[model samples]
Each structure stands twice: as C-alpha cells, then as structure tokens.
Target: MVSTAVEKKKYLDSEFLLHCISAQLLDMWKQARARWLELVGKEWAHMLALNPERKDFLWKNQSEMNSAFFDLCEVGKQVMLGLLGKEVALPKEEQAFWIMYAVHLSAACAEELHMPEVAMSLRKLNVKLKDFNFDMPPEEKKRRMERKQRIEEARRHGMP
Candidate 1:
C-alpha cells in the first residue's frame, strides 16, 4: 500500500513523538506506581482496624484512591489515544515499535516504587489506528468495544 504524505503529517508530527511520549508515560507510570504501593497499604493498613483482608475496601478510606484511579485511567487513555492516532499513520510494522517505547518508559516509574514485591504494571494499550477511507460508524465502534470488553472479561475469568 502506498503511504501518503497527508496521512503521515495528519497528527503524528515527529516533532514531539519521542520527546513527550516520556512525559505522559510518566503520569501513566506514576499512577500505577502509587497504586501498587497503595495495594500494599490496602493489603496491610486497610485492615478493619481489625482485618482488611476478609472484607472489601472501606468506602471512607478509599476516597483518595478512588480519585487517583479515575485520574490514572483518564490520563492514560488520553495519552494512548493520541499515540494510537499517531501510530496508525506509520507503516504497519513500525506501528508497534512506538507503543513498546511507552513500555520502556513505564518500567522506570515502577522501579521508583522501590518495592520489589509490588508487581509493576506495564503500559497495556494497542490501537492499530490507521487511515480509514470511510467514515467510522458509531455502531461499528460500539461493536468493537463490546467485543473487546467480552474478551477482557473472559481473560479476567482466567479463560485463554
């Protein structure tokens, strides 16, 4: 397939691609770094002043964590969406290379937590984002999201 100049220039401006991917990668990482730490705190301190393990997270104590969770998801989504849009502009094989770069950056943030037992989270996002000739129908996108969610649900259930 012939690559067009317009597709390349549309949004994947090379100017900040490599430079600022790190910046947003930081937030994505920082968010997880904090979460993994809180996981331990939740694992330990969160106990019902008696036992936090047997019961679910307490609503009162989780307010801050709740806010952080949403913030993390939103920031990470925006950055990945922007990167995905840009990646689709590149040659197919080259598409994955940039997303992996985000992985490389996220690892650094995990190490900062200084807790080896706290498993680090990877930047798990991949969008083929290519130049589509036809207007993407809302139904098509919704269908894709539904299928994606089902697959995710299965995975969470331990299905291959």
Candidate 2:
C-alpha cells in the first residue's frame, strides 16, 4: 500500500531543539531584566511598571506588533549565537519556526550593526511568518475556543 503522508526523518530530536531554544529564551528573559529595560526604555511605562521584568511579552506577539524598533537585539544576539552551527531536524511544517526566529534575531542584530538591508530582509521574512508563528495545535485551539465560549456565555448572563 502507498502512503500519502509525508515521511518524517527519524534521526534528530526536533522537539528537543524547540524546547532548548525556548528554555534558552526564557532563561534570557529571566536574566535580562536590566538589559530588557536598558534596550527598551520609557515606552512601556505602564506595562513594565506592572511587571518590571516584562518577560511575558517575549513569548507572544510579532516583533512589529510588539515594538516599533529593534526589540530583541541583546536577547536575539544570544539566541542566534546559541542556534549558530547547530543542527535541528524539524518537521516540514516546523522548519520555518527556527528560520523565522533566526531571521528576526539576525535582523535585530543587523540593526544594531547598522546593516539595514540584512535587517530588512529578515524582518520581512519574519513578517511573512507572523501568521504561522503563534499557531496552536488543534487540541489547544479547541480548548481556547471552548474557554472563550464559556466566558462569553457567562458575560451574556451578566455573570462576572
């Protein structure tokens, strides 16, 4: 019997790669409080005031959506360095994940380095990836949808 499903490569741990990068990013967020403020000062007065660390912001939002300028230069530099020369065998659907992040990271660093062209390229590519970046699995999506429905139901009934 012939299979139409794509054959997955069985060698590397793409999931682990994703986890590694995520953890590193979180670690950076945890460690870079001062740096984050240093890089992005004044604008997020109320947002940062509520949570001085502002770590939560990194996990979500497109760069353009998140910042008017290079938002992740210091953090992205470390992230890009961590990913450099590293091999991650991700699935076809997820291949763009790291690439997008890399482009953003490189673009962020390029802005610092005054390479506007490179930064523009990466930023453009990542802008194209905006839709795919924050995607959720079917199960997770269903759960969030259900949650929204419950909240809406409660609100319609004048329940807080």
Candidate 3:
C-alpha cells in the first residue's frame, strides 16, 4: 500500500491541470476587472461633469452600484468555474484553493475601490483558510508546521 504521504502527493499533483485552468481564469478576471474599472472611471468622470451637484444622487445609488458589482463578481466566478470545468480536472483541495485565492484577490481589488465588504470578505476568506493544509515540499512543510505550532502555543499562553 502506498504511504499516506505518497497518497497525498498523488492527490495534490493530480490538481496540476486544475491549477493551470485556475491561473488562466484568474488572469482573465483580472484583465476584465481592470478594463471595467477604466470604463467606469471614465463614465463616472463624465457623469460628475454633467451633474456636479448630484453627488448625493450618486451616493443614493449605492445599492444599484453594489448590485452591479456583485453581479459582475458572480459572472466572473461562473466564468472561472465554467472554464475550469471545460478544460481541467480539479481535485477538491485545489478547487478550494482556487476559490479562496479568487476571493482574496477580489476582496483586495474591492478594497482599493473603498468597498468595506470586499475587505471583510478577504478577512472571511483568511479565516476559512486558517485551518486548511496544502501540499508543500517537505522542508517547507516542516517549517510551516513548526511556525504554526509556536503561534498556537503563544496564543494559548496569551503571549503576543
């Protein structure tokens, strides 16, 4: 029988195709977001010029803007999953990693736009990944494990 470590390695390695797909999807989403931001900025500038005193109206449109932002987010996610499903086989762990990474990136982008929910989402994603274990080289794994243990111990002892 294969050792558990070997089994884990196999499982993780099997996710290579998924990782490739995820990388491609992430690139596409990043480009799309950039383009969208540029377009939105241009349009917003035009709107501001047209209605200088309507700043309050823009604030009142927060829900509409948020809805559109989230809609784009959903479409981006769907595109990521769809492309991956079409081109790659993803194991559960890798899928989780891709999703979490996407969430983190999206949140970061949103934060730059002054979106608090995006930052909050990043915090939530970090909390979710706090207990996750990814495949790592043996030396790196050992170092991380040791670091994690020390952090945990320090937390337990209420040490900063």
Best by TM-score: 1
Instruction: Please give the distance, in angstroms, between residue 138's alpha carbon in candidate 1 and its true position after superposition.
Output: 30
Q: Candidate 1's residue-wise lDDT over 72-108, tens digit each?
A: 3434333444455442344453544334433432343
C-alpha lDDT score of every prediction, in listed order: 0.39, 0.38, 0.42
The residue pairs in collision within model 1 are 47-52, 48-51, 48-52, 88-129
Instruction: List model 2 lDDT by residue over 1-160, tens digit each.
Output: 0011112211112343354445545454334433433343333344556876543223224433333232233343334334442333245524533454444334333444333343235434456345334454899577645644443332223232
- What's the residue-level lDDT of 99 in candidate 1? 41
Candidate 3 runs further than 4 Å off: 1-21, 56-75, 79-160
Misplaced by over 4 Å in model 1 are 1-20, 24-28, 31-44, 52-55, 58-62, 86-160
**Alpha-carbon lDDT of model 1:** 0.39
Model 1 TM: 0.32
TM-score for every candidate vs. truth? Answer: 0.32, 0.22, 0.30
Q: Whole-model lDDT, candidate 2?
A: 0.38
Write model 3 residue lDDT over 1-160, tens digit each, in one string: 1233222322222143244444444444455456644544445466657976443212222344433343335334434344445323356634554454445443444554433343335444344334332234899667645654443332223232
Q: List the residue pairs that clash in candidate 3.
A: none
Model 1: weakest 10-residue lDDT segment is: 125-134
